[PDB]
Enzyme design. Structure first.
Site, mmCIF file in Angstrom:
data_model
loop_
_atom_site.group_PDB
_atom_site.id
_atom_site.type_symbol
_atom_site.label_atom_id
_atom_site.label_comp_id
_atom_site.label_asym_id
_atom_site.label_seq_id
_atom_site.Cartn_x
_atom_site.Cartn_y
_atom_site.Cartn_z
ATOM 1 N N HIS A 68 25.746 -14.774 21.273
ATOM 2 C CA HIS A 68 27.087 -15.334 21.293
ATOM 3 C C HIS A 68 27.267 -16.223 20.074
ATOM 4 O O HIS A 68 26.300 -16.614 19.406
ATOM 5 C CB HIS A 68 27.380 -16.054 22.622
ATOM 6 C CG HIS A 68 26.831 -17.443 22.727
ATOM 7 N ND1 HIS A 68 27.551 -18.472 23.290
ATOM 8 C CD2 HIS A 68 25.635 -17.968 22.362
ATOM 9 C CE1 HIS A 68 26.823 -19.577 23.269
ATOM 10 N NE2 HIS A 68 25.658 -19.298 22.712
ATOM 11 N N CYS A 125 26.290 -23.431 19.009
ATOM 12 C CA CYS A 125 25.162 -23.360 19.925
ATOM 13 C C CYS A 125 23.855 -23.429 19.143
ATOM 14 O O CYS A 125 23.764 -22.925 18.023
ATOM 15 C CB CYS A 125 25.225 -22.068 20.739
ATOM 16 S SG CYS A 125 23.923 -21.911 21.983
ATOM 17 N N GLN A 172 27.247 -19.934 32.686
ATOM 18 C CA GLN A 172 28.561 -20.307 33.178
ATOM 19 C C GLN A 172 29.307 -19.054 33.604
ATOM 20 O O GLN A 172 29.212 -18.007 32.960
ATOM 21 C CB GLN A 172 29.323 -21.050 32.093
ATOM 22 C CG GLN A 172 28.812 -22.461 31.928
ATOM 23 C CD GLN A 172 29.154 -23.033 30.583
ATOM 24 O OE1 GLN A 172 29.393 -24.232 30.444
ATOM 25 N NE2 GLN A 172 29.147 -22.180 29.570
ATOM 26 N N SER A 227 31.691 -25.092 27.760
ATOM 27 C CA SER A 227 31.080 -25.346 26.459
ATOM 28 C C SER A 227 32.069 -25.227 25.316
ATOM 29 O O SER A 227 31.908 -25.909 24.296
ATOM 30 C CB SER A 227 29.903 -24.397 26.193
ATOM 31 O OG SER A 227 29.073 -24.270 27.340
ATOM 32 N N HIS A 232 33.683 -18.607 23.257
ATOM 33 C CA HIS A 232 32.574 -17.730 22.906
ATOM 34 C C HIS A 232 33.091 -16.391 22.403
ATOM 35 O O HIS A 232 34.079 -15.861 22.915
ATOM 36 C CB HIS A 232 31.658 -17.468 24.121
ATOM 37 C CG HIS A 232 31.210 -18.703 24.847
ATOM 38 N ND1 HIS A 232 29.979 -19.273 24.620
ATOM 39 C CD2 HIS A 232 31.831 -19.496 25.758
ATOM 40 C CE1 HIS A 232 29.840 -20.342 25.383
ATOM 41 N NE2 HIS A 232 30.954 -20.511 26.074
HETATM 42 C C1 LIG Z 1 19.448 -20.239 24.270
HETATM 43 C C2 LIG Z 1 20.004 -21.486 23.654
HETATM 44 O O1 LIG Z 1 20.879 -22.134 24.232
HETATM 45 N N1 LIG Z 1 19.497 -21.877 22.456
HETATM 46 C C3 LIG Z 1 18.549 -21.283 21.581
HETATM 47 C C4 LIG Z 1 18.026 -22.118 20.601
HETATM 48 C C5 LIG Z 1 17.097 -21.618 19.711
HETATM 49 C C6 LIG Z 1 16.711 -20.302 19.818
HETATM 50 N N2 LIG Z 1 17.192 -19.473 20.746
HETATM 51 C C7 LIG Z 1 18.099 -19.963 21.597
#
Ligand SMILES: CC(=O)Nc1cccnc1
Ligand SMILES: CC(=O)Nc1cccnc1
Ligand SMILES: [Cl-]
Length: 147
Positions: free
Chosen positions: A43, A97, A115, A138, A141
């Site tokens: 996302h 994110c 969510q 959040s 997306h």
């Molecule tokens: C899944 C998430 O919320 N974060 C994330 C951070 C670093 C690497 N992969 C995922």
């Protein structure tokens, strides 16, 4: 007729029929084609000042409005759909994110973990399909179902 979630619509600008999915907010010209324990998604999140945590690795204080965040999302969708930009590239550069560092990849997940609007969109996407703007606490997306 259509995989539930999909409805027919008419383009205001052109008069051609198109198809809209009210679970994923996807829209497309072709009649859509047509659930697993788990799906895998990436996302691109654009946060706004009303986000549950209005901060990210990009910005200590996220001040943009919900409308401004939606404009950014819509711009990214246009560039992804035209091929000007890859989803992974825009997610790495602009997703609010932490998953931005993994090109937006969230890994695999079941129902009940994410969510609800995100979950519903993710499970309604077909493998390889992209959502339209999906709204959660959040932010907004763009979701890409990869598995
Ligand atoms: C899944 C998430 O919320 N974060 C994330 C951070 C670093 C690497 N992969 C995922
Ligand atoms: C649950 C979550 O936030 N996932 C995550 C966090 C850090 C790195 N990779 C993934
Ligand atoms: Cl920027």
């Amino acid at each position: 007729k259509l995989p539930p979630g999909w409805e027919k619509a008419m383009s205001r600008s052109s008069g051609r029929v198109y198809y809209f999915n009210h679970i994923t907010n996807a829209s497309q010209w072709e009649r859509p084609s047509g659930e697993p324990a788990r799906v895998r998604c990436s996302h691109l999140l654009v946060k706004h000042s009303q986000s549950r945590r209005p901060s990210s690795w990009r910005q200590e204080k996220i001040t943009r409005t919900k409308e401004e965040a939606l404009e950014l999302i819509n711009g990214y969708i246009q560039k992804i759909k035209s091929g000007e930009e890859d989803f992974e590239s825009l997610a790495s550069q602009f997703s609010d994110c932490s998953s931005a560092k993994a090109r937006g990849d969230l890994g695999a997940f079941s129902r009940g973990q994410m969510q609800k609007p995100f979950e519903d969109a993710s499970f309604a996407l077909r493998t390889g399909e992209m959502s339209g703007p999906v709204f959660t606490d959040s932010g907004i997306h763009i979701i890409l179902r990869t598995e």
